[PDB]
Amino acid sequence: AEVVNGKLHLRFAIAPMRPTPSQTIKEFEPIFKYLADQLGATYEIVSPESWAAISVAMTNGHVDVGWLGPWGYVLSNKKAGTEVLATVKYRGEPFYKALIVGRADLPIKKWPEDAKGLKLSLSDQGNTSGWLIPMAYFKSIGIDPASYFEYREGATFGQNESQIQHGLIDLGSDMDRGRNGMIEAGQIDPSKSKIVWESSKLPNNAISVPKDFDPALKARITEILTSLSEEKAQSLMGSGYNGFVKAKHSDYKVIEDAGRILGKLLE
């Protein structure tokens, strides 16, 4: 937070919501422009190439207000004391759930023991809902997925869902917003799969600021974002994103617990 031409000037950053920084900034700059306008501030906006990159940018002091992912926030909080102000709503909900999905014909009476030795497909390690959360779940009950299952990492959620539906793999990670989107789009037949495990609620994101960011501004940013009507918030953001709720660190407990058990919060 600095002064330029006699005015507050803010550095904003948006996670990679869309396949390119250009497309992300096109669709999400409006909520940031709105925020800066409501403060009478000028601004800069960047969109790093990865969810990890925006966490690093915030940690390394390059960002006044960041749209971080939940794990990016928790890590940045641990490393630099980054504070969360709010969480974005998608179709009115500020949270999602990580899933493990299975072929509909899998005989699973006891989870996960009945699935021992089956194929499991998790995502690339940088994906919170596809890897961090389910891997932390297995570790939390004494399971090493690489030894317990016929295990693969690196699949996309679309690969997992299509391969499950076609009977080629057994279990795969997904997240509920994504699975629903694929059903709505007619891209998968949900009768051929079932949810065998769901996480607790995970916050969609974290609107974040540095440690010791001016308390007056924190409050004002929170008020400006949480005051938005569904229609006004949606007019300023990509499809589905339609409000903000006030947030606090404890909302991220499931995320923090997962990073904790995988040794990702050790100094």
Numbering used by the authors: 2 to 268
Sentences copied from the publication:
P. stutzeri WM88 has PtxABC, HtxBCDE and PhnCDE ABC-transporters for the acquisition of phosphite, hypophosphite and organophosphonates, respectively. These transport systems rely on a high-affinity periplasmic binding protein (PBP) to impart ligand specificity. HtxB is a typical type-II PBP, with a binding pocket positioned in a deep groove between two domains separated by a hinge region. A comparison of the HtxB and PtxB structures showed that sequence differences within the binding pocket essentially eliminate an oxygen binding site in HtxB, providing specificity for a ligand with two oxygen atoms (hypophosphite), over one with three (phosphite).
To probe the role of the D206 in ligand binding we generated D206A and D206N mutants of HtxB. The D206N mutation renders D206N HtxB incapable of binding phosphite or hypophosphite at pH 5 or 7.4, as determined by MST with up to 100 mM of ligand. Superposition of the ligand binding domain (residues 95–204) from D206N HtxB with WT HtxB shows that N206 points away from the ligand binding site in the mutant protein, rotated ca. 180° away from its position in the closed WT complex, and therefore, not in a position where it can interact with R178. We note that residue 206 sits on one of the two hinge regions of the protein (F96-K98 and P204-N206), suggesting it may have some flexibility. In the D206N HtxB structure, the sidechain oxygen of N206 sits within hydrogen bonding distance of the V89 amide (2.9 Å), altering the mainchain bond angles and rotating the N206 carbonyl by 50° away from its position in the WT/D206A HtxB structures. This change in mainchain conformation results in a 180° flip in the N205 carbonyl, requiring N205 to adopt a different rotamer in the D206N structure and leading to a new hydrogen bond formed with R178. It seems likely that this rearrangement of the mainchain very close to the hinge region, together with the concomitant change in the hydrogen bond network across the domain interface might result in the D206N HtxB mutant being unable to form a closed conformation in complex with phosphorus ligands, explaining why no ligand binding could be detected for this mutant in our solution studies. Comparisons of the D206N structure, which crystallised in a partially open conformation, with open and closed complexes from closely related proteins suggests that D206 and R178 are positioned on flexible regions of the protein that are brought into close proximity during domain closure.
